[PDB]
Design a protein around this ligand. Structure first.
Ligand SMILES: C=CC1=C(C)/C(=C/C2=NC(=C\c3[nH]c(/C=C4\NC(=O)[C@H](C)[C@H]4CC)c(C)c3CCC(=O)O)/C(CCC(=O)O)=C2C)NC1=O
Ligand SMILES: C=CC1=C(C)/C(=C/C2=NC(=C\c3[nH]c(/C=C4\NC(=O)[C@H](C)[C@H]4CC)c(C)c3CCC(=O)O)/C(CCC(=O)O)=C2C)NC1=O
Lengths: 868, 868
């Protein structure tokens, strides 16, 4: 499919013009150029002057752009015609021996690259604020932003695989369309020529797949072949036109995601948008989409760094567990205590075969099922002590299906010639919709076929009842444990029989995970020096035995491994003395110099070498090597955790210092209760009582997210209604807001059910902001009318209905949209608004104000229970 | 006179001494007490005796092994027995030119460097747990730890000044001892010989200044002398014994503090201990103290870097003050719109003489004073541009004495021939004791001055007519502001008469603080390139003007100043659009390569430019060349600032959430106070109001520890003494304790000076514990005392004394230790008690309890003023 370079067809929505390098004269054109640019008068032929089509300012601007160095920073370029002054978006690019210009009519906002970039600022800010560490959420966010920006029928992210076949990862459509999620596609749908072109043309748009194209009447006298690959007006393949017609998608717009893997540009995938009717999008929007795709790529680059850091942390955890297991008594200690061999490698069962005695943990086959497989391993693979398989049926076990489907994956190791230790992994499930690549290896770029595909279905692919594979480090760890156990109890090869290879001959992987280790006695003399530590330092063990660890071996001068300075010496002494009284593996930064010159930086962990008698015998230290990024991440995480835990003291002090005076307040109120007064004073005391009750209940605190346990108590509306006005009217009194006693007297004549604090929580806060924009001499209007509905068996319906005034300038739109939860940076003053809204709506109520003429009215309605 | 110390042949009588030869290992020098101490209960222990003929076989072998070792400072102390009667001994060895010197010290009846370092673990972890930032707390903690570890009569930190004289910075003494804190001493008190010798032997102990010194004998056939400087038994020079007998401090132990200032090293000071009775301290304690001094020196050197970081942070704040408000309403825009010129430098007032009008701010003399100052500058300083005067009387302008103590320090800058700006600093109060240095240069003490100084209590000196000094960058900022105003209006030196006279015409302050700025218009073309940026990047203004900022100037390839990679290109284009969209300055990390090819790392602050009509006209930004460590600190700080503010806003929401019903309760109380009530009800309501005010007073928001100040006002003690004690009697409702009136009637009857909002916070929360543990039937007694003494000049001391009985089980030892701030785990009640003790300890108030027979007794003392 190479004729893309040699094709004289363009889409019929813009004109294409070609100019030489120096004379700036027309050498090629399109059939619609004369109908569009000129009409709406010399005939547009070869060599016609550019100034005869556009006005003087437009021609001058185009000339200045043509003389510029990097033309990609200037387009789009607004121009006008001669007579009608019809505007156009000139898009200029340069090819070997020519300059090609595209013209598209305007108005079917930007004039450069930066102005065009400005249209994606909201989406970029949305992308930057995302919490880091999850690729799926990032893909969903980006696809949603693209859908909102472009206004297409559907948009989807389409990721490529190693096989070169692809799968959609996210999707956002309009209601009434068939979901495309989770469907794989053959690798031959997108030929390698297309995805090779997409490294340089990162945005492609097709307006109509059923339109009538226009040919490029190139001049015959020119000796140059005008390729059209870099232009925005290319007409696609007939094969692709039929492909798009089959899917019932007419117009399309697609963007590439090129990720710099180390550089190494790799096409991660595509962001493809479809619409069922012809659609045209102006050039600045396409440029903004391209910039957004660049930002998305530089974020998916960070996601893989996070993944690598997580894997490296897992390796470090395995090393720490191995160092733990080194000390305990072998071999039963690996299984009796915790953490045991199950935590060594991610598995589902484990078994030990020591001295014809079987120790089992987790989901393991029946004890009668272990000796025969052990004997089969012994007699079939005598030339190895380790084996791995993701399916026991493939490896040749005759009785694989007789043990059930609970366990299918094996990892076995021979510590001795008779005894064994092996892990079990449960068989996994899961199938893929559509064939991945439909299993057609080797390319088929023949450019002879017309379209060997049509329609679409589910096309499920079956599985082989397999388990997850065993990684490299998950076998290094098992080899390390084998070495430890073999040494403590008193070349070879490890099989790797995976599916579709049926056999492999990997060596034992003599790269054990055992870290550098040393250790001293209680006086300070060296006692241990590992082979790994000897490799790291270049110092033989015999050089550093019966030598003082502090000063002689590690020191600032005359020492074998010279330390940085005296602060390092002091810190090493402090750590070695602190570790005597603590067993926690205190990870401390440790940096030294090798025998030659190499600044080695690691983390050091020190523990006591306790003996059987219970008396310290020395220190056991091991040294784990981590890269700069993980060390910085650990430092930042430690600081963040300390800062987070610091505020707890302040919070507790605040709560106690608010609790004590309120307790004194109930003290003085209950003690003044003895001096009784008239009935009006009794109701005033009741109002103060539930006011302080609400105070304490606010200090008595998932309720931040709106979830409520719905605590229920029996109370009647009089005190709640009085306290709602009492808690707010001091604020309005400064603003000269009067009270009208408009509430009816029939609301209070009926008994009510519901708590006092819960009911009053979602009432008073509404009008608190009212004084903010209310001028002097305002008015307050409150009307209530309880609705008695006899719905239910034991609980009636006291449907609330309250109309509250809304005077002054009131809450503006950018403060009203905060109520519905449509904003991120919600002001702290407004939090109680949506808090009360969520509290009301948890009981299927409503609290809402609508803009009216003169003054608005807040409507409050709740399905509050009735105590009738 | 270091020569006298070198050849001293006298040692203290608490240990023996033996000097042997390098090769043969025979005694060549020995002390008189050695013969009767090492061989009690008798051969010739003269020259040539072998070392092995005095100790048992294991001890002899250990000594012989220790002699043949390169770095032997890691081995001492060495245990040694005697073959005569098995007498324990510490042997401490060192090597000098041609000899090996070993000194022996007897061991009390109750093994290396690392074991000696163990006796300081608690002190080291206490020093490490402190939060950084301040020095006084560090010095106090170090002195307290040394006092607890060594058990001496008094210890004190003694810091050296640049003059080589010193001053006492902290102190801790047993009760009954006169403090020395804050004093000063002449530089001739410590001869430079000892000061130089302290960089080798970092601990010096003297047991008895009155004992009879012993003498060592050395064979006179030697060709070289014997040096005893490094030995830990050397006898001090006689005039120092007289000096020590003057203060009646018989014994002493001093520890040098050597700070390796950036590997140059400097003696920061000493930690001097004193005792009135002869004292002896074993050798491992001296090693532990030496190690703790090393750790303290490291931490001291770590807290002088935060000072430099604060200096740099303050410098990167005067470049971000009035960068654009100057362009509108110049020069009147610097006084009217805040921040004003009073924020440029740390001053007390300002004045702006322009167009014959004064726009004074803060504290400033009358207009006639300013006119007289201006006329004096115009007359007597005709060829001056700006000056800073520490005290206006030293410069001697005629009318200095009229304003007096109101204004002393001045800083004047001259805008033009008539206008100018004044900054004013008031009189500061500062006094020293014992005199600053008692100057007597040229080493007046040499081979003389047996003891021409005797006991003296104090020596008060007063320096008059001085203000705080004007720094260098504080005048660079004024110079740069003068340059800004001179440029916007369209090489001269500045006086620095600061200390005593001899005006120093510094060269135009050769450091104008002005950051490198640039800017673009709306399309993107560069318009501004100031000389600072042109100097930083080595690029002329012409080569950049009329180009494009993105792509042509800052671009990945073929650009004037190439960027690092492509991720640094899409991050500069993002900020140039957010700056316009949001208009608020944004600070980001920047990095690039100059024309010469040097990597530059900066911070970029970018903000939007508007015209008079509020229309955005472009963008202007400037570079803040932060230092490496400052950049990393700000990076890590801003990494978690988002989470910090996210928690802060959530915490602050509850403030309003609880203030609203607090407003309701105040409303109800205020309208219930409007009814007819008896005296008892009135007193109840007054107590309720007093106990309620503390909620709002606490909710004003540091709040945990530090930055705490107590308000002061005139009040009667009856109200608080009743409200605080009444509000707790019913807290233990389930125990029914008995409370009866016990306070003295002479403490209620008087009014005084002091806030009642924190008196409840102090003496009402203390009695919460008394009901938590005491069972039913507990009796509580409160004793009050108001000592009215006139121990002052303008304030009458109405000192408050509180006594509380402690029934029940009482506070255990671990809970008690929390009150003193010496524990990591502090309970909420313990945290509140510690906070209250700190809150009362600023004005010399002691809160404690002592356990007696039956019930313990509390003592609370607070120095309080009287408003009589
Ligand atoms: C949902 C996934 C999806 C797929 C797999 C898809 C395929 C696709 N077809 C693409 C490319 C091509 N696809 C083909 C041809 C074929 N596609 C098929 O279905 C056949 C295997 C083959 C016809 C022989 C050719 C020649 C191209 C080159 C593009 C051109 O010259 O116009 C592209 C590239 C984007 C574009 O140029 O518009 C896409 C995105 N379109 C989709 O919507
Ligand atoms: C509280 C401040 C304080 C000061 C200023 C003080 C001075 C001092 N005097 C000290 C040292 C000396 N200072 C001197 C000399 C003189 N001191 C004086 O008062 C004269 C100026 C001079 C002799 C008359 C000498 C001979 C020494 C001891 C040197 C030696 O014995 O070889 C020291 C160091 C401690 C020691 O070396 O044992 C101290 C601490 N003692 C204090 O406690």
């Amino acid at each position: 499919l190479h004729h893309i370079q040699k094709g004289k067809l363009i889409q019929p929505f813009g004109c294409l013009l070609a100019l030489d390098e120096k004379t700036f004269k027309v050498i090629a054109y399109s059939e619609n150029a004369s109908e569009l640019l000129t009409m709406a008068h010399p005939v547009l032929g070869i060599g016609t002057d550019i100034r005869s089509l556009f006005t003087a300012p437009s021609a001058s601007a185009l000339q200045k752009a043509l003389g510029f160095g990097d033309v990609s920073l200037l387009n789009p370029i607004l121009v006008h015609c001669r007579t009608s002054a019809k505007p156009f978006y000139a898009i200029i690019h340069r090819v070997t021996g020519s300059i090609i210009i595209d013209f598209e009519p305007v108005k079917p906002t930007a004039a450069g690259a930066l102005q065009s970039y400005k249209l994606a600022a909201k989406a970029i800010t949305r992308l930057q604020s995302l919490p880091s560490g999850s690729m799926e959420r990032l893909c969903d966010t980006m696809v949603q932003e693209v859908f909102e920006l472009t206004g297409y029928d559907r948009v989807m992210a389409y990721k490529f695989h190693e096989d070169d076949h692809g799968e959609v990862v996210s999707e956002v459509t309009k209601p009434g369309l068939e979901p495309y999620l989770g469907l794989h596609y053959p690798a031959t749908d997108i030929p390698q020529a297309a995805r090779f072109l997409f490294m340089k043309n990162k945005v492609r748009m097709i307006v109509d797949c059923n339109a009538k194209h226009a040919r490029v009447l190139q001049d015959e006298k020119l000796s140059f072949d005008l390729t059209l690959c870099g232009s925005t007006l290319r007409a696609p393949h007939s094969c692709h036109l039929q492909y798009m017609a089959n899917m019932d998608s007419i117009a399309s717009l697609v963007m590439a995601v090129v990720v710099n893997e180390e550089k190494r540009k790799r096409l991660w995938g595509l962001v493809v948008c479809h619409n069922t009717t012809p659609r045209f999008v102006p050039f600045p929007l396409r440029y903004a989409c391209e910039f957004l795709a660049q930002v998305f790529a530089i974020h998916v680059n960070k996601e893989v760094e996070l993944d690598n850091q997580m894997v490296e942390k897992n390796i470090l955890r395995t090393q720490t567990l191995l160092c733990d297991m080194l000390m305990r008594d072998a071999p039963l200690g690996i299984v009796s205590q915790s953490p045991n061999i199950m935590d060594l490698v991610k598995c589902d069962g484990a078994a030990l075969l020591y001295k014809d005695k079987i120790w089992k943990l987790g989901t393991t086959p029946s004890e009668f099922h272990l000796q025969e497989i052990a004997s089969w391993l012994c007699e079939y693979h005598m030339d190895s002590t380790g084996l791995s398989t993701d399916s026991l049926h493939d490896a040749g076990f005759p009785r694989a299906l007789s043990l059930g489907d609970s366990v299918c994956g094996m990892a076995a190791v021979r510590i001795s010639s008779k005894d064994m230790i092996f892990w079990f992994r449960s068989h996994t499930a899961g199938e893929v919709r559509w064939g991945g690549a439909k299993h057609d290896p080797d390319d088929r770029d023949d450019a002879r076929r017309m379209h060997p595909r049509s329609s679409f279905k589910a096309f499920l692919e079956v599985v082989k009842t397999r388990s997850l594979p065993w990684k490299d480090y998950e076998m290094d760890a098992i080899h390390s444990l084998q070495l430890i156990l073999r040494n403590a109890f008193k070349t070879v090869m490890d099989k790797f029989t995976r599916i579709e290879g049926d056999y492999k001959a990997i060596i034992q992987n003599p790269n054990p995970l055992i870290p550098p280790i040393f250790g001293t006695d209680e006086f300070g003399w060296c006692t241990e020096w590992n082979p790994a530590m000897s490799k790291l330092t270049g110092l033989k063990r015999e050089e550093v035995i019966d030598k003082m660890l502090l000063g002689e071996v590690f020191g600032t001068q005359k020492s074998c491994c010279r330390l940085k300075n005296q602060e390092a010496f002091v810190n090493l002494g402090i750590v070695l003395n602190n570790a005597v009284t603590s067993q926690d593996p205190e990870k401390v930064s440790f940096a030294f110099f090798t025998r030659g010159g190499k600044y080695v930086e690691c983390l050091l962990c020190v523990s006591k070498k306790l003996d059987r008698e219970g008396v310290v015998t020395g220190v056991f230290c091991f040294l784990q090597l981590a890269s700069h990024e993980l060390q910085q991440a650990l430092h930042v995480q430690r600081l963040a955790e300390r800062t987070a835990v610091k505020r707890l003291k302040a919070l507790a002090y605040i709560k106690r210092q608010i609790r004590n005076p309120l307790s004194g307040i109930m003290f003085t109120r209950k003690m003044i209760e003895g001096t009784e007064l008239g009935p009006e004073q009794r109701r005033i005391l009741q109002t103060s009582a539930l006011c302080q009750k609400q105070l304490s209940k606010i200090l008595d605190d998932s309720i931040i997210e709106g979830c409520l346990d719905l605590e229920m108590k029996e109370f009647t509306l009089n005190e709640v209604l009085t306290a709602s006005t009492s808690q707010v009217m001091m604020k309005s009194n400064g603003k000269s807001v009067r009270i009208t006693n408009e509430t009816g007297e029939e609301v209070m004549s009926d008994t009510l059910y519901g708590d006092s604090i819960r009911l009053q929580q979602v009432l008073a806060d509404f009008m608190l902001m009212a004084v903010n924009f209310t001028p002097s001499g305002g008015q307050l209007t409150v009307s209530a009318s309880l609705r008695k509905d006899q719905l239910g068996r034991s609980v009636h319906l006291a449907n609330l209905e309250i109309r509250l005034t809304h005077t002054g300038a009131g809450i503006p739109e950018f403060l009203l949209n905060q109520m519905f939860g449509t904003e991120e940076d919600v002001s702290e003053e407004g939090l109680s608004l949506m808090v009360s809204r969520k509290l009301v709506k948890l009981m299927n109520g409503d609290v809402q104000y609508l803009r009216q003429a003169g003054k608005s009215s807040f409507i409050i309605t709740a399905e509050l229970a009735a105590a009738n």
